[PDB]
Design a protein that fits this description.
The structure is cut from a larger assembly and holds three copies of chain A, one copy of chain C, one copy of chain D and one copy of chain F. Chain A is mostly helical. Chain A has one helix and no strands. The longest helix of chain A is centred in the C-terminal third of the chain and has 17 residues. The two termini of chain A are about 15 Å apart. Chain C is built from 15 helices and 14 strands. Chain C has a five-stranded antiparallel sheet, covered by helices on one side. Chain C is elongated. Chain C starts with a helix and ends with a strand. By secondary structure, chain D is mainly beta. Chain D has a single domain, classed as SH3 type barrels (Roll). Helix content of chain D is about 10%, strand content about 50%. Chain D is built from one helix and five strands. In chain D, strand 3 and strand 4 form a beta hairpin. The radius of gyration of chain D is 12 Å and the shape is globular. In chain F, helix 15 packs antiparallel against helix 16 and helix 25 crosses helix 27. The chains are: A mainly alpha, C alpha+beta, D mainly beta, F alpha+beta. Chains in contact: A-B, A-C, A-F, B-E, B-F, C-E, C-F, D-F. Chains B and F meet through helix 4 and helix 5 of B and helix 3, helix 6, helix 7, helix 8 and helix 9 of F. Chain F: One of its GO terms (molecular function) is GTPase activity. Chain F: Its main location: nucleus. Chain F: Pfam families: EFG_C, EFG_III, EFG_IV, EFTUD2, GTP_EFTU, GTP_EFTU_D2. Chain F: It comes from Homo sapiens (Human).
Chain lengths: ~55, ~220, ~450, ~80, ~150, ~850
Amino acid sequence: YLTEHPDPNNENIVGYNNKKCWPRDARMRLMKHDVNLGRAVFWDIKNRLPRSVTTV
Amino acid sequence: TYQRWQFTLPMMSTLYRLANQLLTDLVDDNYFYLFDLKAFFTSKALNMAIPGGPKFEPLVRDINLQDEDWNEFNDINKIIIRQPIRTEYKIAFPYLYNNLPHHVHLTWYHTPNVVFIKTEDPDLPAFYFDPLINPISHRHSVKSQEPLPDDDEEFELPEFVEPFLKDTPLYTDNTANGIALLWAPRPFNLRSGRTRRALDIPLVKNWYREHCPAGQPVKVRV
Amino acid sequence: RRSRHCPYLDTINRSVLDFDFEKLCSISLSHINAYACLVCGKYFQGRGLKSHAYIHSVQFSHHVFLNLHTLKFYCLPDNYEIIDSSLEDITYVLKPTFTKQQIANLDKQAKLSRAYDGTTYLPGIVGLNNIKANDYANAVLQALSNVPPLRNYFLEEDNYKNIKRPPGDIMFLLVQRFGELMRKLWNPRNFKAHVSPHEMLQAVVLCSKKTFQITKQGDGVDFLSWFLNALHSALGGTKKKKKTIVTDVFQGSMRIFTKKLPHPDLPAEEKEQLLHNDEYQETMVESTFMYLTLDLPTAPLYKDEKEQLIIPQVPLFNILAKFNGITEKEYKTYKENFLKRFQLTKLPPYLIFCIKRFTKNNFFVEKNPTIVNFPITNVDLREYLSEEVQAVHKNTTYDLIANIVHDGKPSEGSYRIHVLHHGTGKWYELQDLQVTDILPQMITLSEAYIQIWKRR
Amino acid sequence: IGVPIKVLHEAEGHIVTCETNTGEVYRGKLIEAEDNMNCQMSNITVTYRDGRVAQLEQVYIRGSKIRFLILPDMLKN
Amino acid sequence: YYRFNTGPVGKGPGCGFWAAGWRVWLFFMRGITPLLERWLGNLLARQFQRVESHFDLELRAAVMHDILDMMPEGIKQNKARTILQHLSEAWRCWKANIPWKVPGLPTPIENMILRYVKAKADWWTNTAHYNRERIRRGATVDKTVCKKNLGRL
Amino acid sequence: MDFLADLMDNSELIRNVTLCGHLHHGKTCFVDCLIEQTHPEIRKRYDQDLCYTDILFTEQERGVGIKSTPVTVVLPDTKGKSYLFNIMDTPGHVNFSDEVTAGLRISDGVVLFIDAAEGVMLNTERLIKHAVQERLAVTVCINKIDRLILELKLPPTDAYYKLRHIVDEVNGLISMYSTDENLILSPLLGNVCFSSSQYSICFTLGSFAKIYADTFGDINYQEFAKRLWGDIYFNPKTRKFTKKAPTSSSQRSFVEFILEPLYKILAQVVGDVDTSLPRTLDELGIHLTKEELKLNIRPLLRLVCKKFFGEFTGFVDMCVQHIPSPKVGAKPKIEHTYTGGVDSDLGEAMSDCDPDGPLMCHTTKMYSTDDGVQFHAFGRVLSGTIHAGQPVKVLGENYTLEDEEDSQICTVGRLWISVARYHIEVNRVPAGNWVLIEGVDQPIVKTATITEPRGNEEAQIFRPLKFNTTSVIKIAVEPVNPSELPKMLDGLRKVNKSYPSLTTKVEESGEHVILGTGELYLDCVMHDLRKMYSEIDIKVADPVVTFCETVVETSSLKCFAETPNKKNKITMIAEPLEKGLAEDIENEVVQITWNRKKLGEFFQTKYDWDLLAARSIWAFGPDATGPNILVDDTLPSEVDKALLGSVKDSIVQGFQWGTREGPLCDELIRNVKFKILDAVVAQEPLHRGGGQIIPTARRVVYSAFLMATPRLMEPYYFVEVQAPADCVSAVYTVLARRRGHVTQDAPIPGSPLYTIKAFIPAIDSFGFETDLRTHTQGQAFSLSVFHHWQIVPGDPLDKSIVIRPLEPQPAPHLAREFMIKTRRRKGLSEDVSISK
């Protein structure tokens, strides 16, 4: 994913999506590694599905 | 017109004597450490209100700074809290102990400690070593490390050369009154100024501006 | 000898090419003496002995590290820094040194200029990566870089360095950095087709006082105008060469005999009085007109032919109508109906036409979806603008070199461009995914945001 | 407190010349300037009226045998 | 009272420092008196949801006035009223997204109608999406307003 | 006004001086009085002082000076002409005193200030000690003399005794710091100037004597000052200074003829308008207008004191008497600041301060322009004359003759040497004068020396700047959003150049850590960063204290690491350093550059170390100042002595790297006596891989530290909390809550206040001053400066109970959780591995 989309400024967690309803201690741990893995998996899913037939 | 008043020092002395009942004894601004207008301004500009300071409705919703998500460094697993970060810490240094301070005000850091002794008995001379003043080491110091002049060999001074201010009392009866007025509150510090209207002279103003009327019920605090 | 004697130099491979990003220390946050890790790929400001670079070499085990300026890989782990010419591909990529004789080879784009990784060089039309926001600015920069004259001017570092850079203004440094990045992108020595515009975007944001920043999507016309003004300022100034090369390349001159025609509310008697007072007298404007701005006609409120969608294609003569149609314009937003009477006197060799489809209505800004309908062939608007200027403008046959068209909704929209290599005439789409697209494929059907043509 | 004596005392430390009543002109750095115009200098050059010139490591000339003195132009501003 | 009864003074009602509240009441009265003066002057004298509707009325009235300026009301009177009909027709012709061509009408009249309808459509879409955003955000809306917004959407 | 530039040419009329203060208010008041005397246009308002030295708005709003202001003018003298004084006013805070350290290299004379009522302070004592160690002249100024006269209303004799006690304490401190014979300071000697800095009342004994001569008679002012300064007593019948004190009820000469007139004038003014009657004014030889009499008590007293006491001529005379001209004073500064030695030909020429010689200017101060985009490097021009447009090579603080790439060439624009009006009309500046070089800011961070490009090819920069305080409070910096991360980083660089004490480090965990000395220091850093250097909003972390790793017990077993090349293994054992050696080495007492015989003699005499151990290769941490010392105790019987000589540099590099990055928290390690037990290595140079030793050396260091008993160490901050007597016990209560220990407590001589010296751990020091001031209801005031490293309780690697995320840990468990949190925050592996 970094080769496909670099993250030198660590801006991956800049626009992450999390559930604000849950309390702070349990909603989502926006660690750099976890955010990077989430973005990588989302990119892999988007690549495995053509942008014409559908989209994510 | 009755707009400007030019008066004398003894009148301030006696008026301050009479108004001691309504005026607090505080003379140094350090007493208003975190109760000056700037401290309340930077408290209002934030959600946190100091225990002695009133609560406020936040200017905006400020949902961004309300509950931020856990980050790599913001995690409490790494932050060590020896002592609670109370509102005093945030108000004192708004630009350090407050993530995203944004629109705040700046508070005065310190004022030199007013070292003043209020007159206790008028008969006793003003220029007197008050017992509260700490004693100093009156060491004999027979050694002469300091430079010394000639012994009856030079320094021929004319008799017409007096020590300047002479034949004038060093201590007078009005010295204590004036030196006490020099550290009076705002209304009495001015020798002579302009009048103010009757309705815009808040006597109680200096009261709540103090830290707290200690030893009071909760309703008084509120 | 010792520069290549160390096996670490062979063990040091270009696993990641991060030179596209800004050159700064990974541990010292300083740009002075920032040596890059030849194997690890991290640039630190330390030195080879008892500093940040020494720590990196003793930790990453990379006995070779390229220098900050000379780009000399460390021959010894800490002793000496002498590069080896065997792996000089990265050195040539980071150092664009194509002279005019080499520029002629660069101008011979017909040769298959395969990159280090085997991609397509695409001189000036390389599908480099663009920022997520303000991609229109990146497209405008690529289209400007698509001109081989622009690449030649950028590669002339000695000519660029000739102009003194005032210490107070940072515009010169940002312009130099952007030109160096463009030259590196257009240089055949490049390895990766995708080039990070992060340094370019930061330079643009800093130089242009945050206008057209990469943080938010920016209008193509405004970004192009700001970039042209910045380029003119970089080359112009206190020097005797007031006419900047970038400015003079696309300067132009319009002899708009502007007439302050009376307001519509003025009756016939008031109009006669104003005419007697020479109010409606034509006054030459001598407008610079760096880039022509041709506005599309009114959008079709009601679709008549096909109710689903009516596309009122504007003939290319509408752009050529500026000789008399603009000269017949008697309209202004002020109280007085100003008569523009526009007349382009001198047509610049480079013609930059802005459609300006986006326009602000009384409530929201909307874009006319009218098709461009502009053929890519010879034009005669210069002769129409001034018949006598045809002798001066012998090469009136201008072909649309690069056309960029917006797409999507005005709020969440993107852009796509197609550029043709000068001489070669590839006419390929500059989009990274669609690198090769020669046929128009209804190119004029979309609302072309801007077009750039050369007099040739 | 005179204006000329104050200008002579303020000119101490700079290069200046002094022509005495006997014709001897001594030029050098004014180390010390007295109230009565007594000037003590160090490393000065003294030229007599006959034309013979010499160098002195340190001298002190009184104002009673001094005719005139020329200071630098920095004291004019 | 807290201070007055601080010490030897009794805890009774014997407190006399009215100035502190007297000044506050004086200030509040000073603030209030403009209102009372204004209303008393009004009596002493003898004269004792519209934004979208306002803009629609402004558009239609301005277009009608422009037509009556162009169309010589001193000669033709009735047809001008019928002109309004085409206005409405044009408007619904825009709403139905159906072709609208009236060869009988003059070309400048058609251009004026096109300008009117484009301005009205822009304003109408703007207010439609604005009211939809207001409704979905949580702002309170009326039944008729909600139905109109739904129709526009 | 061209005389200001004319006097700059005369190298003997310049007086390079830097100021010091207990609090920035006192020194800046004096600077403002000087500016008002020199510049008649600027007049201080009655409500508040002008404070011309507080350029920054942060200092103006907070009330405490932030950055040193090097601004002054040509000033006259009673017995001398006008000299172009240039004074760098310094902030009056314990942490901010680090900035004053830069002024230590700006000038060779410190005109120290001490408040009359407050007396000696921790900041004043630290500044005096640092100046004594810096080899500079010291001229004391009794500040706020009106406090004793007015605020305390002490008797004149008691006031004189208090002033004499303060002077004696200052002299004792100076004598303890330095053994030079010039340590004598007294009004008779001319090293004490009584300058209240309020009401423009400044004088010396000579100033009073000159005033007496002007009033009447023709008494020689020098003799009168030499006589009336001390307690020599005056006999009216004999009418002379009579040391025998013949008169029974007479007062001392200073009390009778100096303090008494000031007391009488103050009593007449403050006492009443009729007390300061026109008759009294005429007796004092002053005729104030009716408007001046109609003013309030404070403005009237200020005007009376200013008109009566001249224009601060006494201070100028005192400075001229003792503070030398740059030509005279350049030689000691050349000896001290320059690391190239005064024996160098260029160094010898600089010692003569030749304007026409080589150009050698040392710039250490950094000042931001009004727009904030560009900076300007402020520094003294030791030798040569800098001209506008002339290129110069700016060798940085890290520049060395080994590599010429450490220096860069740059052009110098307008100079703006004159700072009183802050104008940039200066074209060229001669040697010995401060110059604000413009355009060379980019190549240099701080404390860098500019030189002529081609005139000299061997001149090197001066020694790196050193500070008495140590930055121990670290704070993380992140942007609100990463989208504009570099912009903030730009401001971060602007922070590094602007503040020499602040240290910006890019940690391996991707966090930008700012290191500062005090909480207020870092608060001012962040305010300047957000408001000026980087408008982006910045998120921070809770302040953290840099920790140290120490040993208490010797290593149980030897630790050996083998080089990959043919298994060349070095074995070592680490032992705790001898008690008291850490601060001795850290105080630059002994350097690695010293001769082997001298170091051996020192160790045998002071610490009674073995001569063979002393003769071993010694490392002593980085730059020979690290408390963790390394001794190569390898047995000479082994054949590795030649190999050790061929690997001494690699071993030293490995040791210094291990000292910089330890095994626990990778922080600094101190007081470790690393003994290099032995090493077996093949003599072949091929097997002597340079990169195979330093990692092995640091692995050996980590294993030895693990083999020995490891302990954590926190920086105990010295705090001189001054408080009224009643709250004194309550003050101890504060130290009770914040784990503080009271070291000493003494009443202030001549003042009702009371000083308490305490040693507060840095972990609980954050906000300690706020707690003390709020709990004492705004009466007590504190000031904390780092004092010494103290071993934290517990064991860093002992398996202890994991603490709660939001609950303070018990004392035995502090070390382990400190270690784990520091390791995790740094980005390294949290768990400590004995194998690693």
